[PDB]
Amino acid sequence: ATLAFILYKYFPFGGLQRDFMRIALECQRRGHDIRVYTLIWEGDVPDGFEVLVAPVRSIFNHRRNEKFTAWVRADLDRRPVQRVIGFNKMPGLDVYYAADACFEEKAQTWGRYRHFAGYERAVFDPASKTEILMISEVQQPLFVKHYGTQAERFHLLPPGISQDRRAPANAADVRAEFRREFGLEEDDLLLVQIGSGFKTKGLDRSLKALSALPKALRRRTRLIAIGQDDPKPFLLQIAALGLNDQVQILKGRSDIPRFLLGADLLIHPAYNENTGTVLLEALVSGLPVLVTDVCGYAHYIAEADAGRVLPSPFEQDSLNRLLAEMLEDAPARAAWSRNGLAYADHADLYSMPQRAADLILG
Amino acid sequence: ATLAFILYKYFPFGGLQRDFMRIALECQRRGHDIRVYTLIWEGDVPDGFEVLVAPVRSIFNHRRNEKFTAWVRADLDRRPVQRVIGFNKMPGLDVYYAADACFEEKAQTQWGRYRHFAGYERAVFDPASKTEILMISEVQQPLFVKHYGTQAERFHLLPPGISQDRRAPANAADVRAEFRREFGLEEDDLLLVQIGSGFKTKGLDRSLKALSALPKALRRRTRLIAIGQDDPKPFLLQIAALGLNDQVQILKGRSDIPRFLLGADLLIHPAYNENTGTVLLEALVSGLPVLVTDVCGYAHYIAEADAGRVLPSPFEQDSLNRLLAEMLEDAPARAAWSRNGLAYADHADLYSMPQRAADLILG
Ligand SMILES: O=c1ccn([C@@H]2O[C@H](COP(=O)(O)OP(=O)(O)O[C@H]3O[C@H](CO)[C@@H](O)[C@H](O)[C@H]3O)[C@@H](O)[C@H]2O)c(=O)[nH]1
Ligand SMILES: O=c1ccn([C@@H]2O[C@H](COP(=O)(O)OP(=O)(O)O)[C@@H](O)[C@H]2O)c(=O)[nH]1
């Protein structure tokens, strides 16, 4: 009957959050009752969802998290459910959805440390019964290295791109309306950098590449970054590069598909990225992609011939050259667009929720 | 009841893939249930096919393949079948369809990748192995025997399995006329086609060089169309360097290959290596003259049919340049090569592979 889903924060403009929502909605469509435990819920609550916001707090995140697990534990003791699915690492999970990378590995590069390490071990320890849903093949060996987790407990899932990201029948109309709204002409080249966490996702690298463009391309090129981050540190870089009139940083928003159809390139030179849903959202929108090979979903871009993947180790000069080459070549971008849409029509990019629900429900 | 077919990748525009599909459909028509294990399946699943896509990935291709094997065996242990047919070399096959050349030979022409692929090849071809081998390239059989000592009686040479739609139709002249009209080819234009994904291996680099080297008269008349799923950029760079921007197109994969075969004037295929080369025979049965390197397993058909020219090893670009020029300049010879191909296609056994394969698979 009842499934309990646990995540620290729900809000619409995050990958973890969207993945949880799509899994919960799939489970509900199979006739299961949906209960959710969280510290905060922003936006609409779907019909039938029982969302419980925990009345606990602490100025220390780790202490807050401890109070949260105690609260959920107590509620579950009184109000039992059939299965418990967590999207953050903690004790008492039947299933864990591995949105995050391995903490212990990242640590090797103490109250807070012992909290996050312990909560990771609560999932991955060989004595834990938690089943792990993986979305990255890269991180599975790292969990095993640190914890010795049994192989049988890992289940690799494909992507779970939503259908509203696919280019619609009226894609030309949507693009035209967007470009009108933003005052873009046919010779303007709009780069989009999408996702909260601009530092990690390489906005600094993107700005440098834009600034380094040859004169003719530099005049034509604009960038919009979309994320919840404080823009203030980046405005300093923008001013020093002389890009005040060519860069905008927008807050999170729901109409990402418009931007994917209206833009000319998605740029994503992340320092690290477990997967990178926006990479595939661009692909299924027919938006060419420039991405670093460190991203877990970068391989799809190469495999689909839907953009360019920058090889490691990162060189800013190499990014600069590649951006210029992609922007200069309108035929190539037209081909990358066609190739993405073709790939999107046969590739297994959408089935994560069905695969996850099958494993969750048995 | 149930037959298990195993191939790492299914997609429409490949020889291995097309051969697999033809055999599977034939076996189904004889009343068998079809199960397929793969890492990726592009396209519709035929009615009645049980297609299992293994949820396994790795940073190393060869390690992924190892996980795939274990995944398949685990399923077979719980859901057994009558016979297991593989189109890639691996342990646990009752029957292997030799869609690949001898790996050990190429390796000689540790390293984790080498050990994996050598081990999987040995799993099939070792004298102690029970796997029955369906051969499509006779040229490769002595190399497997040299390297592994595989018993002669475990090899079964299949004929080609060219599909009916590649044979020149009654309205061939009209199809050609329409194609050339569409692409804007006049009677004095010469179209080369290079067909098949894997352009580097199949020698598109050599083809473009040969085109560029043509005498001025021929060069100006000659066009090339390449058709495959490859990233075109490395070839577009070469095309620009050779000054052939106005004379070459590189197209993505497509299903209407027959009209290109009928519309073209030569198929060029100077491959570095090629186990067989389906497109060579497709050209032949379309009456399209062929220029091919002798390394291709099906090159001997071109010579036997007298339906083109085979460039002998070792490869020298100058000799390809010369041969292309000689073939393009001689319109009577090309007319003869076309007639010879069509004639050969009317008597040779180029079509029956799937029925032969099913016979051997099902006993
Ligand atoms: O204003 C915005 C910004 C983003 N999004 C959407 O949010 C998702 C972002 O996903 P992704 O590109 O994967 O970014 P992250 O959410 O930062 O994902 C990283 O971080 C997660 C952990 O929080 C991991 O699960 C992922 O594997 C890892 O790539 C996409 O659907 C975007 O369309 C919006 O709808 N609106
Ligand atoms: O765009 C394409 C490219 C190839 N093919 C077919 O794919 C097969 C390629 O087989 P071949 O043995 O020539 O090449 P391989 O797949 O072994 O590299 C032939 O039947 C081609 O007609 C096709 O239908 N469309």
Report the CATH number at residue A56.
3.40.50.2000
* β-bridge mates for residue A224, sequence order: A192, A248
- Is B59 close to A138, i.e. CB distance below 8 A? yes
Residue pairs spanning A and B at CB distance below 8 A: 23
Cβ atoms of A278 and A194 closer than 8 Å: yes
Helix or strand or coil: residue B196? coil
Query: Helices A61-78 and A111-124 meet at what angle, rounded to 10?
Result: 40
Cβ atoms of B304 and B286 closer than 8 Å: no
Q: How far is the CA of A12 from the centre of ligand 1 (A)?
A: 10
Residue A231, min C-alpha distance to chain B (Å): 36
A223 with A320, same domain? yes
Cα–Cα dist B196/B267, whole Å? 11
B280 with B244, same domain? yes
Nearest to A156 among B43, B57, B252 (CB): B57
A20 with A152, same domain? yes
A210 with A240, same domain? yes
Q: Which two tokens stand for residue A349?
A: 């990019």
B133 with B12, same domain? yes
Cα–Cα dist B208/B244, whole Å? 8
Q: Is B278 in the pocket of ligand 2 (CB under 6 A)?
A: yes
- Is A155 close to B55, i.e. CB distance below 8 A? yes
Radius of gyration of chain B (CA): 21
Residue B184, min C-alpha distance to chain A (Å): 21
Peptide bond into B314 cis (omega under 30): yes
The whole domain housing A54 covers 2-161+351-361
Question: How many residues does the structure list for chain B?
Answer: 363
Selected residue of B233, B235, B251 to mutate for chain A interface (largest A Cβ count, 10 A) = B233
For ligand 2, atom 21, which residue shows the shortest CA distance? B279
What DSSP character marks residue B183? H
Q: Is B196 in the pocket of ligand 2 (CB under 6 A)?
A: yes
Helix or strand or coil: residue B192? strand
A148 with A203, same domain? no
B291 with B188, same domain? yes
Chain B residues 262-321 within an 8 A CB cutoff of chain A: none
For ligand 1, atom 23, which residue shows the shortest CA distance? A16
B42: phi then psi, degrees, rounded to nearest 5: -100, 120
One DSSP character per residue, A95-111 reads: EEEE-SPPHHHHH---H
Angle at B51 between CA B46 and CA B57, to 5 degrees: 140
Q: Exposed, middle or buried, B261 (CB in 10 Å: 0-12/13-18/19+)?
A: buried
Domains: count for chain B: 2
Helix or strand or coil: residue A269? coil
A168 with A115, same domain? no
Residue A356, min C-alpha distance to chain B (Å): 12
Helix or strand or coil: residue B57? coil
Cα–Cα dist B245/B71, whole Å? 48
Q: How far is the CA of A195 from the centre of ligand 1 (A)?
A: 6
Nearest to B231 among A137, A157, A305 (CB): A305
**Interchain CB contact of A358 with B (< 8 Å):** no
One DSSP character per residue, A44-99 reads: PPPTTEEEEE-----SSHHHHHHHHHHHHHHHHHHS--SEEEESS--TT-SEEEE-
Residue A271, min C-alpha distance to chain B (Å): 18
Sole residue written with tokens 């103490």: A110
* β-bridge mates for residue A156, sequence order: A134
- Is A348 close to B53, i.e. CB distance below 8 A? yes
**CA nearest A326 in B: which residue?**
B233
**Resolution for this PDB entry, in angstroms:** 2.0
- Is B57 close to A305, i.e. CB distance below 8 A? no
A132 with A206, same domain? no
Q: How far is the CA of A227 from the centre of ligand 1 (A)?
A: 10
A203 with A143, same domain? no
One DSSP character per residue, A226-237 reads: ESSS--HHHHHH
B165: phi then psi, degrees, rounded to nearest 5: -75, -5
Cα–Cα dist B175/B264, whole Å? 11
Q: How far is the CA of B167 from the centre of ligand 2 (A)?
A: 15
- Say if residue B113 carries a ligand binding annotation: no
Chain B residues 42-71 within an 8 A CB cutoff of chain A: 42-43, 53, 55-59
For ligand 2, atom 17, which residue shows the shortest CA distance? B15
B152 with B178, same domain? no
Strand order in the sheet with B190-195: B248-251, B222-227, B190-195, B266-269, B290-293, B308-311
Q: Which two tokens stand for residue B306?
A: 């007298």
- Structural biology method used: X-ray
**Interchain CB contact of A348 with B (< 8 Å):** yes
- Say if residue B18 carries a ligand binding annotation: yes
Which atom, in ligand 2's list, is nearest to the CA of B276?
Answer: 12
Helices (H), ranges, B163-268: 172-183, 204-213, 216-221, 233-242, 257-263
Centroid of chain to Cα A209: 23
B276 with B248, same domain? yes
